[PDB]
Write a protein that binds this ligand. Sequence first.
Ligand SMILES: CCCCCCCCCCC[C@@H](O)CC(=O)N[C@H]1[C@@H](OP(=O)(O)O)O[C@H](CO)[C@@H](O)[C@@H]1OC(=O)C[C@H](O)CCCCCCCCCCC
Ligand SMILES: CCCCCCCCCCC[C@@H](O)CC(=O)N[C@H]1[C@@H](OP(=O)(O)O)O[C@H](CO)[C@@H](O)[C@@H]1OC(=O)C[C@H](O)CCCCCCCCCCC
Ligand SMILES: [Mg+2]
Ligand SMILES: [Mg+2]
Lengths: 277, 277
Amino acid sequence: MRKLGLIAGGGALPVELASHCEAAGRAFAVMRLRSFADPSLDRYPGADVGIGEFGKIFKALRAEGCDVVCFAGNVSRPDFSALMPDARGLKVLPSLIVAARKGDDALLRRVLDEFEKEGFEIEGAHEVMGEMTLPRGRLGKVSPAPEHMADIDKALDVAREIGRLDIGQGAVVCEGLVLAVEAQEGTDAMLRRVADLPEAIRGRAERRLGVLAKAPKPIQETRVDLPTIGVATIHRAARAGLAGIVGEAGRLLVVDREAVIAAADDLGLFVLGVDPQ
Amino acid sequence: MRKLGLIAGGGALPVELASHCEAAGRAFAVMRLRSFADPSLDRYPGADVGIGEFGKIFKALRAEGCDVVCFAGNVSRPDFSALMPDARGLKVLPSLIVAARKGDDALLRRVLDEFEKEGFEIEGAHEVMGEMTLPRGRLGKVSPAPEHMADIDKALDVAREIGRLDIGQGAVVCEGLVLAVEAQEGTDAMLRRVADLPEAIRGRAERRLGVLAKAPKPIQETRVDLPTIGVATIHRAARAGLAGIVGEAGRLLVVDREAVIAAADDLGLFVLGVDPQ
Ligand SMILES: CCCCCCCCCCC[C@@H](O)CC(=O)N[C@H]1[C@@H](OP(=O)(O)O)O[C@H](CO)[C@@H](O)[C@@H]1OC(=O)C[C@H](O)CCCCCCCCCCC
Ligand SMILES: CCCCCCCCCCC[C@@H](O)CC(=O)N[C@H]1[C@@H](OP(=O)(O)O)O[C@H](CO)[C@@H](O)[C@@H]1OC(=O)C[C@H](O)CCCCCCCCCCC
Ligand SMILES: [Mg+2]
Ligand SMILES: [Mg+2]
């Protein structure tokens, strides 16, 4: 996982991105564009730079060891007279004004040419999310078996009806039997209480049965964060003799992706991203 | 609690009654009327008597130390020639034939006069249930406070929506916060996991908050038993700093009523029966 240089313009997108990055445990820093970046970003490591202190931005970008950057947020073309660039900066400035004369698009494009020529890999907001969340389909080497399809389907739309009822975000289904429903206790606790059920209605570590599904509750006016998967999640779900874990393909954060994949792989669990709706 | 002499005619009523009696831990015996009583009653302590081996029935009734009887099930008037009474029996027989000449009602009534004159307290099926289940309103000395009304209302219709979803039969609500939802793990386990939540979102043993509601799932073609309340239920709900417990007034079995009342009373919990629907 490349460390991210989040270049933050105005609005709520970079803010969401930062939080999700920190939840996923992904490494980053924030380049907060003066007068654009929302102040609730000052809490993250990084730097407050004006446009176009390009010299400064490359400086801090390398200073944080970012090799990939994402540009997220509202930015409008500036005043080119009132601009107070550093000397890098002033070097780039005319190239900008030419492109600017051709339109915002050519201008934005020109800015990116510079970061590429400098040179950092450029990523879009969607791809940043994509790489931290579930994929579509298996995450590790283990796939589900036809036996598990049954539970996978009902694990989810149960876990969704829980969410619709503003309760918890998780549910464990084994052979059609809802064994466990999350609400307020955390997923670890639930997976423990499941390991504790009679092996009769349960899966076995030898022969595994049953599926953990964890799905996000529907959006709100209040900001909404995504459900998460830990390495300890893989641990306890294995100890419950569960066959695998599942969630909506974009809508679930994986904390330490590498580590999670290795637990699931070593223990025989599948982890599955599922097409939303 | 008077020990019950369940006098079992045909059909599924006495069967249900026996099971509920045994779930409530209430003392009983079954007088299984030959050719009437369903054979799944042979498992319970008691006796197989024909009508009208009255001598036998009084004998075994006392032999089980029953001082109250309930007549439950289908019975039709018999053949009075083909009847093989014992000598008690034959003594009573004519009194019966007189009443029988006035109608089934007078006949049934006459039978009851005999058990009363013998003499056992006669109870109806409904009253038998009533005395084992919740009442309507408080069960013990403790009442709910106005503060608790909030949770009481939502504890229940949550616990009902769980039941509608064929999951578990219980739910714990505190200050509007669903803390816990039962499914497959038993109520004891849930009440433990609740005692384990942060005291921040929880009630305190000093100042109590929150309510356990446990409600029956909707009827089925398959026979349906009632949710139950234990003394350990009172224990753990107290240890979770809950203010009280609640259920539908007829629709919840109390196991060791005396003992439960004394736990709730000594610990400061209310236990509340609520009008169904
Ligand atoms: C110190 C050095 C700092 C260097 C400054 C770098 C700032 C670059 C500008 C970043 C804007 C970028 O975050 C916006 C963006 O990408 N959005 C694309 C997206 O559409 P949205 O609906 O707006 O989400 O998806 C679309 C595709 O589906 C796509 O087309 C949208 O692109 C735009 O939003 C267009 C821009 O909003 C137009 C503004 C151009 C940049 C103006 C300022 C240029 C920098 C000044 C340099 C001196
Ligand atoms: C060894 C000694 C054994 C002695 C034998 C004792 C057997 C007594 C008969 C028991 C019948 C009783 O269980 C039924 C009953 O109570 N039901 C009442 C109830 O209505 P349901 O809709 O039927 O539930 O609620 C109604 C009120 O809302 C009420 O009216 C219904 O009463 C009846 O069901 C009427 C009976 O079904 C009619 C039958 C009379 C008894 C016939 C056999 C008499 C015993 C033979 C003695 C030799
Ligand atoms: Mg982009
Ligand atoms: Mg009666």
